[PDB]
Each structure stands twice: as structure tokens, then as C-alpha cells.
Symmetry: none
Subunit: 26 residues, 12 copies
């Protein structure tokens, strides 16, 4: 199970670049 | 199970680039 | 189960580039 | 499953490039 | 299941390039 | 199981770059 | 400037399901 | 400026399900 | 400025499910 | 600004599930 | 400024599940 | 500012599950 979150050089944003993930698997 | 999130050089955005994912699998 | 998200160099956007995904798979 | 999302070099957009996907599969 | 989304070099758009997909598959 | 969170050089952001992941696997 | 509305199969309602989205800017 | 509304199968409600979104900017 | 609303199968409610979102700025 | 609302299968409620969000700035 | 709301399968409640979020600045 | 709300499967409650968050800054 490989997970990688990398947020770089994100500036001056308003209400932006928000990530919401709801994943279900069987 | 590979997952990767990369946000780079996103600037001065308003109410933009928002990701909302709801995936269900069986 | 491969998943990837890459947001790069998206600037000065207003109410744009918003992704909303709701997938179901039986 | 394979899923890819890539947003690159989208600038100065108003109310544009929004994706809203609601898929079902039995 | 393969899904790909690629938004590149879309600039200065107003109320354009919006995608709204509601797909059902039994 | 590999996890990597890297937050770098994100400045002057308002209500932005937030990540919420609710992932379930079997 | 982008408005998508879908109302279907809402029956026998009383003072219900009223949506008001207002924005003022200056 | 981007508004997506989807009301379906809401029945026999009374003074319920009312949504108000207001934003004044200055 | 980005508003996504989805009401589905809400039935026989009384003074319920009422959402109000307000924001004033100066 | 960014507001995502999803109400699904809420039935027979009385004075319940009411959400208020208010923000005042100066 | 960023608000995400998801109410699903809340039934037969009385004066319950009421959420108030207030923020005053000066 | 940032508000995420997820209420699911809360049934037959009386005067319960009520959440208030208030902040006044001066």
C-alpha cells in the first residue's frame, strides 16, 4: 500500500486546491 | 494499492482546483 | 488499484477546474 | 481500477473547466 | 476500470469547458 | 506499507490545500 | 454565470426544497 | 458564480430541506 | 461562488435538513 | 465561497439536521 | 469560505444533529 | 473558514448530537 501526498509551492490561494476523497473497496 | 497526490505551483486561485471524489467498488 | 492526482501550475482561476466525481461499481 | 487526474497550466479561468461526473455500474 | 481526466493549457475561459456527466449502466 | 506526506513552501493560503481522505479497503 | 438545476420527482412538498444562492460583490 | 443543484425524490416535506447560501464581498 | 447542492430521498421531514451558509467580508 | 452540500435519505425528522455556518470578517 | 456538508440516512430524530458554526472577526 | 460536516446514520435521537462552534476575535 503506497501513499504519497506532496504539496509544493502553493501560494496566495483562496478556497482552492482542497482535496476530499472517500474511497471504498472490496 | 497505489495512491499519489501532487499539488505544485498553484497560485492566486479562488474557489478553484477543488477535487471531491466518492468512489465505491465491490 | 492505481490512483493519481496532479495539479500543477494552475494560477489565477475563479470557480474553475473543480472536479466532482461519484463513481459506483458493483 | 486505474484512475488518473491531471490539471496543468490552466490559468485565468472563470466558471470554466469544472468536471462533475456521477457514474453507476452494476 | 480505466478513467483518465486531463485538463491542460485552458486559459481565459468564461462559463466554458464545463463537463457534467451522469451515466448509468446496468 | 509506505506513506509519505511532504508539505513544502506553501505560503499565504486561505482555506486552501486541505486534504481529507477516507479510504477503506478489504 | 454557470447554473445547472435538476428537479425531478419532488411531490407533495410544503414550504420545502427552496434553494437561494446569492452573491454580492464590490 | 458556479451553481449546481440536483433535487430528486424529496416528498411530503414540511418547512424542510431549505438551503440558503449568501456571500457578501467588499 | 462555487455551490454544489444534491438533495435526494428526503421525505416526511418537519423543520429539518435546513442548511444556511452566510459569509460577509469587509 | 466553495460550498458542497449532499443530503440523502433523511426521513421523518423534526427540528433536526439543521446546519448553520456564518462567518463575519472586518 | 470552504464548507462541505454531507447528511445521509438520519431518520426519526427530534431536536438533534443541529450544527452551528459561527466566526466573528474584527 | 474551513468547515467539514459529515452526519450519517444518526437515528431516533432526542435533544442529542448537537454541535456548536463559536469564535469571536477582536
Amino acid at each position: 500500500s503506497y501513499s504519497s501526498i506532496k504539496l509544493s509551492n502553493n501560494n496566495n490561494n483562496s478556497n482552492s486546491n482542497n482535496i476530499e476523497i472517500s474511497k471504498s473497496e472490496s
